[model samples]
Target: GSCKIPSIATGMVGALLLLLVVALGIGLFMRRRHIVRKRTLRRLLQERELVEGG
Candidate 1:
């Protein structure tokens, strides 16, 4: 009867929370990737410069 609304609301809440978590994780992943890529690229360039200057 009226119990349907409660079940539906709870289900939607859980679904929305899951979506939020995935979205946040995706953002974090991109940020981490950018940081790592920059660090590695900078190291690579530094090494190249050292070799050339050596």
Candidate 2:
């Protein structure tokens, strides 16, 4: 029978946690970009309507 050390398991858990955090950060950034794009488009549309009315 063989036994493993606690440090090895701890290191692997830490690495996986770091990877998860990075992936979450990227997802949040992408969502923010999409929201900004939609807001800009809405503003442009409103401006066009005003010009057409004047």
User: Each model's number of backbone clashes?
Assistant: 0, 0
Q: Could you tell me which 10 consecutive residues in candidate 2 have the lowest summed lDDT?
A: 45-54
Per-residue alpha-carbon lDDT of candidate 2 for residues 1-54, written as tens digits (9 for 90 to 100) = 998779878999999999899988988888887766587877887878866543
Clashing pairs in 1: none
Deviation of model 2 at 8, angstroms: 1.6
Best by lDDT: 2
Best by TM-score: 1
Q: How far off is residue 41 in model 1, in Å? A: 18
- lDDT string for model 1 (1-54, tens) is 354456868899999999999989998888876865577777787878866544
Clash tally for model 2: 0
RMSD to the true structure for each prediction, in A, is: 10.3, 10.9
Runs in model 2 lying further than 4 Å from the true structure = 1-5, 34-54
